[PDB]
Amino acid sequence: HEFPKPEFMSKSLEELQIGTYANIAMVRTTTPVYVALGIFVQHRVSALPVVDEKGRVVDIYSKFDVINLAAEKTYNNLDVSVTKALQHRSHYFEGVLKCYLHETLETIINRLVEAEVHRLVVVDENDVVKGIVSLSDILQALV
Template sequence: EEEELEFQQVEKATSLFNSCKIRHLKSMSKVTSCFDSLVAVSPEDSITAICSQLFEHQLHGVPVVEGGTALSVVTAFRILQYFANNLESKPDFMTSTLAELGIGTYHQILTILRETPLIVVLDVLARRELTSVPVVDDRGVVVDVFTQDDVLSLGCWPDLFDFMEEPLHDVISLIEKDGIQRHKPVPTCRRSETLENIVYRLLTNVGQRSLVCVDSEGHIEGIVSVSDILRFLYEIFISKKKEKK
């Protein structure tokens, strides 16, 4: 009886999906009401207001909603891209270095040893709500960066659970053997590089949202992300706005 009931439920769900059309979704109150509890912005909000939402809620992107309908998603990356593409003249601070501007995070940087079991890495990413984590060897030299894109690629493995105890460097090798395009070389930078160069590198490397700052020997010093740069620009804009008042 249970199997028959389950079969009927599947048949009913299949019939519902086959008969449902896009226009039906607009009239479903359950679909539109789900936006009430979401952090969202409207098409009329300023870039400043959107940045404020991103920073306040520690988000990488927010949905643009109008009349209960999601129109798109605006991300920190897209805002930085807009800023870079619409500069009429280059601000002086763009030629200053990361060290001079103080952009990035340089304290309590989490790293993962390349021998760490995959299950531990996944647990760390989930609990810390991280999108990536630098991978180091036994000398503390950065040898890779394990990202959320790598995690997503694991979802294609039918026998994923058999690899949970495997060291991360072996898992990464298998991902690359599957033909998955990953960041090459390791996305690192130096604190002596200019902001202009860092912005260019972040915007021209597809899928890359942060760079690992290293010293001359490759040891990690910190991380600079798209959000770090956007926050810097936001604070400059806000301070200048207050000065005008």
């Protein structure tokens, strides 16, 4: 009763049926922060895939991103795009934004731990959103 069990580390996301694949909330690169704030508070989601004009995932915008914005010493208002969070970090260029259903849990876990990120966006061959895998989903499996 190695933790985690090797036979489950070698399995794919699809095999383990890990993630949420319906009713995903997401925003656009052109979305103002005030919109994200409203959805976080009222809809009760902790992070939102951020998609470009072509429907492709280019970032993920989280509650921590809003708090980071709040702590900036420079003058801001809520009418700035969610893309301003990109000044602080790039999940995209670090390869810690996306994953595929065929990837193993060992790959997924290592990718999360690499950048200390708490979720990944499951995408298709066009980088369009299929779903989300967060720490909660991985734990649910691990038990």
